[PDB]
Write a protein that binds this ligand. Structure first.
Ligand code: TPP
Ligand code: TPP
Ligand code: TPP
Ligand code: MG
Ligand code: MG
Ligand code: MG
Lengths: 545, 545, 547
């Protein structure tokens, strides 16, 4: 009798389901598991804080449609991981957080166990599902569920709880192998009702001023060719939400991004593609026509009529829907009014002109617009990068200024406006892709995951971090209104040199005060493939609050 | 009619309740509140991550018996703060986390608000209470409750939710002033049943081998003189739990710490003073006599019989209890058997001898024992510091080796074994005391709150950070068992120089490889009162897992 | 080697802790547990629905200060009992609900087990603590905690989860006996700050118009003699809340009940004794002087400053605080001003006279006032009874009109205004005391637990149920506003005869349309000690609608 244990079973389950990376922080009881997973050919990436590890996991699920794996220990590590699990769920990114937990009997009586918490029920409100495995023969089915749940419907976080004892529990090795489940097709296609598809084309054909909105669901769907084809056939102006930038290149002629306010105020029929009417679209109220009619393509029927009533729900998975939308268009082709495209273009150009003047006008110190014009100069010549971006002014201005050329290349604060996602998204993106990453970081944003620069160095990841050091949150020029001369609630240290942090870890730092310095430092950064911080001196007074 | 708003009301409530510091991270909707609080003479301390701010708040409540105040924004900031609120509750440290929340009507319908979450119900499982204020006329009563709840019973975290709209809501300034509540005596004395006090002395008088255990509740109580007096009158050997070190100096003759295992294995009557029989005392099972009888002084009746049956519960607040224990002793004095004190001392000395040999034996590279012998050399000559300590080996060895001379001077990982508490406890301790802090940090532990070094610099706090750089979690010598040469799950960067991090922020760094270097670097550190990192090179193989 | 199992251990643990009654409803996996508990001398009371079993447990807790035991099966049984656990925690009544649950491994993975629900987490929001026991050797200590938690602080419900596997799990009998825990003094006395006590007496001694308020915390504490001596010594007028009626008799010359709103509107110093400034006291807001100063005796510091700022908190158990208050009074005596007592008495008199016209005036049909005057005349002669009461007009009028003479004899809708406590309360009160119970029930109220009349007949309990049948919720005279002639939302069947329900179970029914018939039926009911229903024909227009 050859015998095995839960730890070995779970690692084998992960292997057969083609998990090739784990993002984590170890400690009791999970160290041996991570060692063995690595032993078994799984890439283990160890972080300085579990939050970043969970952010890396979610980033990777967003890029692949395969759930990223976050590994943590019991209560204090689990809780740090839980904050990233929550954010994955909110954003619709698939991931599974696997955490050690303590002794079920002790925790159930609340006697004060090591790292005691009911982790399973603690995760429930933040996860699509929360599963706990008490028997090693159930590990494989439990992972099967975790995988399916994480990628079906609107994708999200799943919590898988592994009590210390299930990892130690033994079974016959042969029988164990029969309990392992390899999931085929974890999220099947769900096709819309044909009649809703035909109503959708019909209402679009009757539209005087149609607009398509592409959200993260559109991006996640990988239906890039189908979307382009639909948009181009009917010449329908579209707006990309932040992380849908690049499905079609941002400089595409049908992009209404440069006159977004005007487009939303005037469109008479709006077609949401995996985009919620949440605060990011002002709930379809402020800045919109009183009378807009909506078509909505969403995988999740519970999202329909969440905010404004939806004339044409088109419920099913987005690729499937666009397949059928395409076929129905071919049977009943139309072209969007030229006058609409034309009035759009009029606004687009006035706005690009005003932008251009801000972008080409040099200043000392640098502001957000000339600084980002410099970044854009370099990124135009380096189109195969991933862009991670977080902050306030640093976020809004980079979103508007940096164009994306390819789909699923932008990672940012997201639906909850989280400061802290940059390092982890940077690591998840580069581990997943093997490509360089540029992280354009506000200086407050940066400090929420800063220590992860050590991890970037430890794994020799090609990430260049560009910090917009304006000396604080929004602006660097706050004053202590007491007359006591203390830093104001929004000030960070006057003239901090973030590029130096890298000295500690044998990585590259540049300090940049001008666009020419910035251009050089950022080009070298990317082309070197070395971990790098670029500290960018930004006028403390360039930001708005 | 002079009019005021919720923001102004809440700041005034905080002022009248003698809140003089707020630890926080701002953003929407709380920036204006922090600015005004600072305007009104409240010291605002702004962090890089809310977790550290909440740790600072809890540290300050532990030292003062006054709840520390943690201020955050809505969902993503609230969630980061929640992880420190949870830890305060677990440890029995008073604090109030005040967070902005969004629009109640939008969140209640789950329509996708800005930073949407039911923060109130999210905090419930981690807090003594969670309150939400919808009317500005209720702000003062709500803060009154927050304060009382946080400090009564076993102290803990309280969540106070302030929707964006209550901060904007206006009322007549004069009437507003009548709605503000100044709490007098937030936690009244609770005196034990006289009969339980007399049973307690009685069972102690009959004891052959009595032992007292002092927990964090004993420490928090500030009953230092009463405890010393009781222990010395009856000559009762005591053990200090980690953060009760220093109530009586650690070198006190009645301290059984150097033969802790023996003391617990043999004591026949154990008197718990604000110490739980949780995992930290192995639940009163493994390493204890089959037949130990317990006396327990605890403020919380729900803690009695949690683990082992308790012969003599003494329920009431600890100062009150020790008052009555003292009076009853005087009426019925006894002395602990000399033979017990003597056998204890026999073990104590054998153990101090073995320790001494590890401590005085020089090595290259340094190990935990000679390194800490060096720290202890410096701390003997600098007794007015606060000691923050976290890690694994760094934690266990510093606990055993560094003596405390005064009460409530040690801050560490605590009941949940949290890596990440060091910077925040360091900042909370120095802001609260005005004294220097020495943080003895494992290198994994450090990276959970590292970025807070900027904050230490921004406020020019006298904190010296001593990092035990063994190159990883527990040990620095892990190997990738795949044969791929990747860092093992436990390795951090080979030879990272954490002292350099300080360059970024205009603070002091030392690298130390020997005890003489360490001694010099640490003395200068403290006496300079400058923010400092000491990177200490530790044999990667000195630790145990 | 003699073996035992979890089921045997928990029963022994109950026995050693002096549990002598369990209220429940059996089924998988607890039927054998109940059988064996009964075999071991524990009295088993089985119900038609678990919520009444849970209501009976919490009544038994309030009466005795020993947690009542409610037993249920898994998910659907559990959830019914949980509604009653909720009510106990809200009212401050100690009880423990012990529920069987299913297989931990299956429920943890949400595979659709038999009766699947994480019952422990389900109970958490409604209970002082929720515990779950996985190992048989942990059963005794789990019960010890449940007991201590249920009775310490402000008492409340505790949930104790017994997975089917733990009940069947075996261990050696001798080793098993060593893991049983007998709790001595589960709620220790907690003594107030003596400074609080001296400040309280001094504020009372400065008051021009002091008022004591007795809450159900005062009734639960069992400090009847200390509260009475304190009140009578300084001659402080007192208001009893509903379930505090009778600590001192309601006819006591110092009761301000007959002038409640005057008393609250005009007192300058008010001493709350286990009484919360919650909605039953209008939060200390509406109907109170603008600057009332409060002294508050409560065991729970969390309750202080909940609503109004409290001038003098006196935190500790009510018996110990009253012991300190009396000793401080004896050192520093004072007598409430005669003028305040005399002016209260003038208002009590105006109100008492208004109430007397209503009570004494005959009507056909009967109304609440003359019907209850007849009930009061009967109850004055039977001061050993327990009074259960619920409904709306039926509750408020009985509460004002039926005087209590002894403490802890009145049981009602309580803090959450629950309809459906009536039969549970009647059963727990009679089983607990051995005494007759009279339940004065609104007809809508009764229907929430009416099938428990079979339980009452099964155990031959001395319960007389008097239903004020006005044909509806508040009133029986509603009309369908659409014109279709359907019953209105507040109507119940016109002229239902609830007295006839008892023929199913060999109980006694009376139907009564007059005060003389009511008086006779109710007297015969009480004396008979037989399960009885009295259907009282009340005017459908007599009631007012709350809101
Ligand atoms: C975890 C978290 N904490 C706090 C906030 C509130 N918040 C919004 S923006 C921001 C930082 C803004 O400054 P910065 O990143 O430096 O960019 P800048 O505006 O200065 O370019 C913060 C802390 C948040 N969104 N997330
Ligand atoms: C937030 C959190 N994450 C993970 C753990 C698990 N854990 C225990 S010790 C430890 C770090 C141990 O190494 P280190 O701090 O460097 O001290 P050393 O043993 O090397 O001296 C970790 C991550 C924890 N307790 N808390
Ligand atoms: C469990 C529950 N359901 C509903 C209510 C709402 N409610 C208040 S009083 C009442 C019944 C009133 O009628 P009745 O009991 O017949 O008294 P009457 O006023 O007619 O004498 C109800 C159902 C409640 N309080 N509890
Ligand atoms: Mg900034
Ligand atoms: Mg280390
Ligand atoms: Mg009725």
């Amino acid at each position: 009798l050859q015998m095995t244990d839960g730890m070995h079973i779970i690692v084998e389950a992960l292997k057969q389901n083609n998990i090739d990376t784990i993002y984590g922080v170890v400690g009791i009881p999970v160290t041996d598991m991570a060692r063995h997973a690595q032993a078994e050919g799984i890439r283990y990436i160890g972080f300085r804080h579990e939050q970043s590890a969970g952010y890396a996991a979610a980033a990777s699920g967003f890029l692949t449609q395969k759930p990223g794996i976050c590994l943590t220990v019991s209560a204090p590590g689990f809780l740090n991981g839980l904050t990233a699990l929550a954010n994955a769920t909110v954003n619709g990114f698939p991931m599974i957080m696997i955490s050690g937990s303590s002794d079920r009997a002790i925790v159930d009586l609340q006697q004060g166990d090591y790292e005691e918490l009911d982790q399973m029920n603690a995760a429930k409100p933040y996860a699509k599902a929360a599963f706990r495995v008490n028997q090693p023969q159930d590990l494989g089915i439990a992972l099967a569920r975790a995988i399916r749940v994480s990628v079906s419907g609107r994708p999200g976080g799943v919590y898988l709880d592994l009590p210390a004892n299930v990892l130690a529990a033994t079974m016959e090795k042969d029988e164990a192998l029969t309990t392992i489940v390899k999931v085929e097709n974890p999220s099947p296609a769900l096709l819309p009702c044909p009649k809703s598809v035909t109503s959708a084309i019909s209402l679009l054909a009757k539209a005087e001023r149609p607009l398509i909105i592409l959200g993260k669901g559109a991006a996640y769907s990988q239906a890039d060719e189908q979307l382009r084809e639909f948009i181009e056939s009917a010449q329908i102006p579209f707006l990309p939400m932040s992380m849908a930038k690049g499905i079609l290149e941002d400089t595409h002629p049908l992009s209404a991004a440069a006159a977004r306010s005007f487009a939303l105020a005037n469109a008479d029929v709006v077609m949401l593609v995996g985009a919620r009417l949440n605060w990011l679209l002002a709930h379809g109220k402020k800045g919109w026509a009183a009378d807009t009619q909506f078509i909505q393509l969403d995988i999740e029927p519970q999202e329909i009529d969440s905010n404004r009533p939806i004339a044409v729900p088109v419920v099913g998975d987005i690729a499937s829907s666009m397949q059928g939308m395409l076929a129905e268009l071919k049977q009943n082709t139309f072209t969007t009014p030229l006058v609409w495209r034309d009035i759009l273009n009029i606004h687009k150009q006035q706005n690009a002109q005003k932008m251009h003047e801000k972008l080409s006008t040099d200043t000392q110190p640098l502001n957000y617009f000339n600084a980002l014009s410099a970044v854009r100069d370099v990124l135009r010549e380096n189109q195969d990068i991933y862009l991670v971006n977080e902050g306030a002014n640093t976020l809004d201005n980079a979103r508007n200024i940096i164009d994306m050329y390819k789909p699923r290349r932008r990672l940012d604060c997201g639906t909850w406006g989280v400061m802290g996602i940059g390092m982890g998204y940077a690591i998840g993106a580069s581990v997943t892709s093997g490509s360089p990453v540029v992280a354009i970081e506000g200086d407050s944003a940066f400090g929420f995951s800063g220590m992860e620069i050590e991890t970037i160095c430890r794994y020799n990841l090609p990430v260049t971090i560009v910090i917009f050091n304006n000396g604080g949150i929004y602006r660097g020029d706050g004053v202590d209104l007491s007359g006591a001369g203390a830093p104001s609630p929004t000030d960070l240290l006057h003239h901090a040199r973030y590029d130096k942090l890298m000295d500690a870890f044998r990585g590259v730092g540049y300090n940049v005060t001008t666009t020419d310095e910035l251009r050089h430092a950022l080009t070298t950064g990317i082309q070197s493939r070395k971990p790098t911080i670029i500290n960018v001196v930004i006028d403390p007074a360039a930001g708005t609050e």
